[PDB]
Design a protein around this ligand. Structure first.
Ligand SMILES: [Mg+2]
Ligand SMILES: [Mg+2]
Ligand SMILES: [Mg+2]
Ligand SMILES: [Mg+2]
Ligand SMILES: [Mg+2]
Ligand SMILES: [Mg+2]
Ligand SMILES: [Mg+2]
Ligand SMILES: [Mg+2]
Ligand SMILES: [Mg+2]
Ligand SMILES: [Mg+2]
Ligand SMILES: [Mg+2]
Ligand SMILES: [Mg+2]
Ligand SMILES: [Mg+2]
Ligand SMILES: [Mg+2]
Ligand SMILES: [Mg+2]
Ligand SMILES: [Mg+2]
Ligand SMILES: [Mg+2]
Ligand SMILES: [Mg+2]
Ligand SMILES: [Mg+2]
Ligand SMILES: [Mg+2]
Ligand SMILES: [Mg+2]
Ligand SMILES: [Mg+2]
Ligand SMILES: [Mg+2]
Ligand SMILES: [Mg+2]
Ligand SMILES: [Mg+2]
Ligand SMILES: [Mg+2]
Ligand SMILES: [Mg+2]
Ligand SMILES: [Mg+2]
Ligand SMILES: [Mg+2]
Ligand SMILES: [Mg+2]
Ligand SMILES: [Mg+2]
Ligand SMILES: [Mg+2]
Ligand SMILES: [Mg+2]
Ligand SMILES: [Mg+2]
Ligand SMILES: [Mg+2]
Ligand SMILES: [Mg+2]
Ligand SMILES: [Mg+2]
Ligand SMILES: [Mg+2]
Ligand SMILES: [Mg+2]
Ligand SMILES: [Mg+2]
Ligand SMILES: [Mg+2]
Ligand SMILES: [Mg+2]
Ligand SMILES: [Mg+2]
Ligand SMILES: [Mg+2]
Ligand SMILES: [Mg+2]
Ligand SMILES: [Mg+2]
Ligand SMILES: [Zn+2]
Lengths: 77, 91, 252, 63, 112, 135
RNA sequence: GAUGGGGAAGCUCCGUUUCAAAGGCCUGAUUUUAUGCAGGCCACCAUCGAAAGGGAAUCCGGUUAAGAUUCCGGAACCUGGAUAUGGAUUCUUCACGGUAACGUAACUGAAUGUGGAGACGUCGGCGCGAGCCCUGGGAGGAGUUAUCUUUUCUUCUUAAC
RNA sequence: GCUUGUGACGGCCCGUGAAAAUCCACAGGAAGGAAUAGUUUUCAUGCCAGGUCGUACUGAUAACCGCAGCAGGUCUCCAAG
RNA sequence: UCUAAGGGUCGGGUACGAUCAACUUAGAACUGGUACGGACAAGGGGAAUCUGACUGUCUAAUUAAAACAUAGCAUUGCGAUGGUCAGAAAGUGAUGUUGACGCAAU
């Protein structure tokens, strides 16, 4: 239902109690005109809404993935 | 480029109903459709719909009046009679 | 023989009024303290078509003297009355088009609409588009006022019986020819089921006093007695004369 | 192939015509088109300064 | 070429039965029923649609916060703010000239 | 004579404060870099003192008498100049061009105007100004 | 079409707010206790009558021998009920801002009053959206190929929220 | 372009083209409310619940009505080149 | 098989150029067993007499008409304690959410 950008807010969601599960999605997409790049979406499933945050940058991507709560059930792909 | 010699608006009824009815109807049609001067704001925006009801395009005043025309002959000669008799009760 | 048409009209099946779209009963304000000792002011908030009625209605708004609230009345719009005008109803009210005053309080020659028969009956006489009554006099002891009705009649009512000053809006409506069956069709469609009309001379005997014959003819005088009986009265009832009226009519 | 030869102007003769010229193209549509071209030419010429508003106003009504 | 069917049992084209044709992720045409368009609220004095107020269907106005139902000035979601100015001025002037009438007829009672 | 001057009371005819009475603190009669119109700085009353009666006593009266003020830059065309006049001495220094710009400065400005208005209302001065204009 | 009524030998007929002592909500007063009295209201007078009128809220994909806006999957929304956490607000108690139209994540509001929505004919041309139709490039598959055709057909989709 | 939706306008009337449930807002200011800390669930998030009956198929030159698998009758939506 | 006419989009200091997308209309050649709205589709026309003005209506299942209706014209009744009509009766009912520019009857 909802999309998210502020990366601080996203983290606070992952810790928001009722959030049991998240999921990470990977898609090949193209950069501007030319070559491709690896886009990755971070989907948190809340009680009444599903928040997803795109990280278009492969670098911020992985270093974000480790920051996830170890108590979270994360579905990879 | 005058389109009709006489019938005017009445040329919609064609050949039907006979001339003297169209004559009579045309007179009262030209009466009822035409735009009238607004007593209150003084633009000629007063038009009919629903016989006896005349309202103004802007300023949105509505006046009760004759069926096919804003002021009816009798209404006027009543308007002056009421002038007169009221002045008796003043002076 | 059958039951003829004008008899069937009485039990009101298909003959009742087509009332759905009408704005309401048009009445003067209930005759209360304010109106009979004082006056009371209201604003006409609207003037509106009434379905099946040739004259507009004026929705007029008054304060409620005994409670905090607005009580809306429906007058019959007098010609020249307009939206936003202030209307004055009462014994002590001034004489201007649109105000409601007891007949006893206006000089003769005043022209007045929607006038009550008995005081407080919330209006009776001269309500159709274009009509009005005139005051032709007063007799202050046993206080009366004499009026000429639209019919030409003269009648004497109570000086407290209320009129409203002026004539009713929508006049001249009958001057315009209907021109075609449909315009009449659409007319009665909003009134009652009176249209069209079969000539009782084109029916069979079982149907009408005028029915039957090997030619269409009434066969006996079409002037019927006042003392006639239901199923007999079709014709010119109680007619005291007949034939084309030559000469001015105009009550003396 | 037939539509191409149409746009090349063929098969349009008086014997290929069934609807009246009004039903084929409305006279009103031609006018509304044409009248909008003249209407909006005046507007640019006026907003360029190429034409002065007083000349524009006469042309708008002569249009 | 692809035709469509009603999505409910009412077969008829009534005002509450409007249809809309829509392309689904499946790559097919499906119908969908269309709620009647809401109408804008209106001013009590003049009768124009009053601006700043969200235009919803009546029970939907309970699903929305009060700032969608009002504008700030007094008589907010109610009258059209030119109409409020009118009845501000008119109020002040008539309360003023009311005082003008008290003191003038007070003089009439003193001098007469 | 020009009637928009330091004493004039007026009614706000447009905007959130429409229908509220103010006092011009100082006129800008023509122009500005911003505000490209004849305008005025006004101290005005937002939430009026409610009626008091004998039935009211103790510190309930203190409540009914609390006055919430406001201050505004206003186009002249939104003011309805009144005949009444109230004295601006106390808050003349308080209402300035520079009072607007920095909300913290506006809040202190109202603080003075609030005390100035509540003073004036008790001891029944400039009475009309402290009653709501009903429309 | 019941009801206080009024007719009628009577089956029943009339009347529908009508000549009637016509009823119930918000809370307080209880800390013998469970709910009497305390105010103030409101005087609306049954009810039945629409699977085309009015009307709170759901979508796509998938699935069956036979059910699907009902099942499965995913994603929503409405109504009622509870409620805590964050934010907002207040020492000028019940928000600020904009000249103004107005703004915004909030932003106390009983009685009573009022305003809007619900909520409305028909036809005409003009404007725009949607779906369809037409069509260029390219990426695939299929058809024709004695000869001719960079060709003929088809896939290229995006729901509510 | 076609079907449809919709807007701003215009023609028409002695025709001027339903009702109620229901929802909201405003005017009002009754009252209740803070500094040792009160008010706020029309802002966000969060918890629970959502009953009863219909739901198959035909809708017609064979699933209805015409004694019938009758050339009759029987309301409507989608609509390609 | 040709010709001409009819449009859109831009930059111009305070006369034009440039590109893109449309069937419509008229005129000209050539051409054929003189054919060509080539199937489909698609009004017979004229002069009078009788009769109803017109559009509309009816005998389902032998009569669609010149019959009924209609606008138009004229007549009648009636101011409510009423006119016309309903009911066995009634604290009953239709016209009537009405009032003579109205209702009712011919
Ligand atoms: Mg008999
Ligand atoms: Mg009735
Ligand atoms: Mg009939
Ligand atoms: Mg007849
Ligand atoms: Mg007749
Ligand atoms: Mg016969
Ligand atoms: Mg007989
Ligand atoms: Mg006889
Ligand atoms: Mg006979
Ligand atoms: Mg005869
Ligand atoms: Mg034309
Ligand atoms: Mg153009
Ligand atoms: Mg001009
Ligand atoms: Mg279905
Ligand atoms: Mg329709
Ligand atoms: Mg708003
Ligand atoms: Mg909004
Ligand atoms: Mg009964
Ligand atoms: Mg029911
Ligand atoms: Mg229903
Ligand atoms: Mg429905
Ligand atoms: Mg499916
Ligand atoms: Mg199925
Ligand atoms: Mg599911
Ligand atoms: Mg809830
Ligand atoms: Mg209320
Ligand atoms: Mg209401
Ligand atoms: Mg409806
Ligand atoms: Mg395709
Ligand atoms: Mg939906
Ligand atoms: Mg209308
Ligand atoms: Mg609303
Ligand atoms: Mg909430
Ligand atoms: Mg089914
Ligand atoms: Mg089926
Ligand atoms: Mg059988
Ligand atoms: Mg059959
Ligand atoms: Mg060219
Ligand atoms: Mg060009
Ligand atoms: Mg005929
Ligand atoms: Mg005919
Ligand atoms: Mg027959
Ligand atoms: Mg027979
Ligand atoms: Mg025939
Ligand atoms: Mg026959
Ligand atoms: Mg004749
Ligand atoms: Zn006007």
């Amino acid at each position: 239902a909802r999309e998210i950008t502020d990366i601080k807010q996203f983290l606070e969601l992952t810790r928001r109690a009722d959030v049991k599960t998240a999921t990470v999605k990977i898609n090949k997409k193209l950069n501007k005109a030319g070559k491709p790049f690896r886009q990755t979406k971070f989907k948190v499933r809340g009680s009444s809404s599903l928040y997803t945050l795109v990280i278009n940058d492969a670098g911020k991507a992985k270093k974000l993935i480790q920051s996830l709560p170890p108590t979270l059930k994360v579905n990879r792909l | 480029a005058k389109r009709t010699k006489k019938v005017g608006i009445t040329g919609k009824y064609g050949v039907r109903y006979g001339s003297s009815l169209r004559r009579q109807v045309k007179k009262l049609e030209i009466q009822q459709h035409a735009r009238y001067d607004c007593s209150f704001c003084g633009k000629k925006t007063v038009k009919r719909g629903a016989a006896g009801i005349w309202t103004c395009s802007c300023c949105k005043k509505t006046v009760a009046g004759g069926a096919y025309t804003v002021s009816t002959a009798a209404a006027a000669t009543v308007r002056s009679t009421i002038r007169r008799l009221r002045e008796m009760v003043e002076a | 023989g059958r039951v003829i048409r004008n008899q069937r009209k009485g039990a009101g099946s298909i003959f009742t009024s087509h009332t759905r779209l009408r704005q309401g009963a048009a009445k003067l304000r209930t005759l209360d303290y304010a109106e009979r000792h004082g006056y009371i002011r209201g604003i006409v908030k609207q003037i509106v078509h009434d379905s099946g009625r040739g004259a507009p209605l004026a929705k007029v708004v008054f304060r409620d003297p005994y409670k905090y609230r607005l009580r809306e009345e429906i007058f019959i719009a007098n010609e020249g009355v307009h939206t936003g005008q202030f209307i004055y109803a009462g014994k002590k009210a001034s004489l201007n088009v649109g105000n409601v005053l007891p007949l006893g309080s206006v000089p003769e020659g005043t022209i007045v609409s929607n006038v009550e028969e008995k005081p407080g009956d919330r209006g009776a006489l001269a309500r159709a588009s274009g009509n009005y009554v005139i005051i032709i006099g007063h007799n202050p002891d046993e206080n009366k006022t004499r009026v000429r009705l639209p019919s030409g009649a003269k009648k004497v009512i109570s000086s407290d019986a209320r009129g409203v000053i002026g004539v009713i809006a929508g006049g001249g409506r009958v001057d315009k020819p209907l021109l075609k069956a449909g315009r009449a069709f659409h007319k009665y469609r909003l009134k009652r089921n009176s249209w069209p009309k079969t000539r009782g001379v084109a029916m069979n005997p079982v149907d009408h006093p005028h029915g039957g014959g090997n030619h269409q003819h009434i066969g006996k005088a079409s002037t019927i007695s006042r003392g006639a009986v239901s199923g007999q009265k079709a014709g010119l009832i109680a007619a005291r004369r007949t034939g084309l009226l030559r000469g001015s009519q105009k009550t003396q | 192939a037939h539509a191409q030869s149409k746009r090349e102007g063929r098969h349009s003769g008086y014997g290929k015509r069934k609807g009246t010229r009004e039903a084929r193209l409305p006279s009103q549509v031609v006018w509304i088109r044409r009248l909008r071209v003249l209407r909006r030419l005046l507007a640019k010429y006026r907003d360029a300064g190429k034409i002065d508003k007083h000349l524009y106003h006469v042309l708008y009504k002569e249009s | 070429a692809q035709r469509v069917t009603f999505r409910r049992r009412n077969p008829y084209n009534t005002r509450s039965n409007k249809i809309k044709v829509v392309k689904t992720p499946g790559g097919i045409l499906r119908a969908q029923h269309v709620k009647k368009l809401a109408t804008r609220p209106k001013c009590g004095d003049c009768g124009s649609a009053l601006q700043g107020i969200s235009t919803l269907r009546p029970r939907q106005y309970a699903t929305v916060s009060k700032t969608h139902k009002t504008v700030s000035r007094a008589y907010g979601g109610s009258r059209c703010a030119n109409c409020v100015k009118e009845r501000i001025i008119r109020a002040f002037l008539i309360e003023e000239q009311k005082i003008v009438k008290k003191v003038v007829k007070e003089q009439t009672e003193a001098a007469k | 004579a020009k009637f928009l001057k330091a004493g004039k009371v007026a009614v706000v005819v447009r905007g959130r404060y429409a229908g509220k009475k103010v006092v011009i603190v100082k006129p800008h009669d023509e122009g500005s870099k911003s505000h490209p119109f004849g305008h005025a700085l006004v101290a005005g009353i937002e939430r009026y003192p409610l009626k008091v009666t004998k039935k009211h006593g103790a510190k309930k009266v203190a409540k009914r008498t609390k006055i919430k003020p406001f201050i505004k830059v206003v186009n002249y065309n939104h003011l309805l100049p009144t005949r009444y006049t109230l004295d601006v001495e106390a808050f003349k220094s308080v209402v300035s061009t520079e009072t607007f710009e920095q909300p913290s400065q506006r809040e202190e400005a109202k603080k003075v105007v609030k005390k100035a208005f509540e003073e004036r209302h008790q001891a029944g001065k400039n009475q009309w100004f402290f009653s709501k204009l009903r429309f």
